[PDB]
A paper describes a structure:
Controller proteins play a key role in the temporal regulation of gene expression in bacterial restriction–modification (R–M) systems and are important mediators of horizontal gene transfer. In contrast to all previously solved C-protein structures, each protein subunit has two extra helices at the C-terminus, which play a large part in maintaining the dimer interface.
The protein crystallised in two space groups: a monoclinic form (P21) and a cubic form (F4132). The calculated Matthews coefficients were 2.38 Å3 Da− 1 (one monomer in the asymmetric unit) and 2.01 Å3 Da− 1 (two monomers in the asymmetric unit) for the cubic and monoclinic structures, respectively. Thus, there is a crystallographic dyad between the two subunits in the cubic form, whereas the subunits are related by a noncrystallographic dyad in the monoclinic form. Structures from the two alternative space groups are very similar, and a least-squares fit of the monomer from the cubic unit cell data to either of the monomers from the monoclinic unit cell data gave an RMSD of 0.94 Å. A comparison of the dimers (formed by a crystallographic dyad in the cubic form and by a noncrystallographic dyad in the monoclinic form) resulted in an RMSD of 1.31 Å, reflecting a slight hinge movement at the dyad interface. A similar analysis of the monoclinic form of C.[name] reveals the same major features at the dimer interface, with an equivalent pair of interchain H-bonds. The buried surface area is reduced by ca 200 Å due to a small outward rotation of the final C-terminal helices relative to each other (residues 88–96), which may in part be due to the observed differences in crystal packing contacts in this region.
Residue numbers in the entry:
A (entry chain A), B (entry chain B): 1 to 96
Write the structure that this text describes.
């Protein structure tokens, strides 16, 4: 998982490390330390934990694993497109 | 990592479990077993190994972590768009 993706998504949500960890199911006594460890690259979450974090942060989980900034932005944006916008992109992509 | 993403990307490349493992730097004696284990969900690769697999398979690594089929397809397709198509999508996404 890319640490800067996790940090960015948390900053965008506007929530603290402790609050993110807590909503992700971590004992609040350890919540902030655990999140800080992930964000500093000391430990990597497993895919199951990353999915929990992504759910709390309201992002597609694969955003956290996307090294390419342009693709990351597309992922983050797709996430919030209305159904007509998604259709247009889906159609544009069809057969390509 | 999603096992079906790994398997699909390997089938699309048209290469065997052994050849994928080998090009990914695994001792050929263990290559196919190791790949089969990943593809059957017995072990999960770490992000560094997933990046190696994705490089061999010529896909954005985050494809392997994308649960949503529509987003997966967008990722796989973006991967192969010409520079003008990418520009159009980038522009469409701007400010959204």
């Amino acid at each position: 998982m890319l640490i800067r993706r996790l940090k960015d998504a948390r900053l965008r949500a506007g929530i603290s490390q402790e609050k993110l960890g807590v909503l992700a199911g971590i004992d609040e006594a350890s919540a902030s330390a655990r999140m800080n460890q992930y964000e500093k690259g000391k430990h990597a979450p497993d895919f199951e934990m990353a999915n929990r974090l992504a759910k709390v942060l309201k992002i597609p989980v694969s955003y956290l694993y996307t090294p390419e900034d342009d693709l990351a932005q597309i992922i983050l944006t797709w996430n919030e497109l209305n159904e007509q916008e998604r259709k247009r992109i889906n159609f544009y992509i069809r057969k390509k």
